[PDB]
């Protein structure tokens with residue numbers, strides 16, 4: 716409903732949006748991730764990861780170093796506000812997070828941390 720969004724990551728390393736708006740009055744927000752295409756998780760897995768704009772570079776750097784078996788996220792990374800699991804084609808995953816983790820006026824970025832994906836698969840998340 717109002718406090719959720721569906722996003723897709725395809726075989727061409729594209730998310731189907733580059734901007735998410737979250738109603739600032741939502742208590743929680745949910746992202747429903749899916750993966751059109753046929754490529755398996757070990758070739759073209761995608762996740763959806765949320766951080767401040769400022770933290771994205773470090774999250775990406777350490778995440779893509781962490782390997783497939785760690786969903787390309789540094790374990791226990793405090794900079795990651797929320798994240799789905801890593802999914803392959805035909806799979807689905809949702810994450811819910813607390814909209815109080817988030818500041819009106821702050822610059823948020825969502826992105827996909829697997830090797831080669833982050834520059835091609837990112838966008839803004841903003842409260843309205």
Ligand SMILES: [Cu+]
Nearest residue numbers: 761827832836
């Ligand atoms: Cu991706």
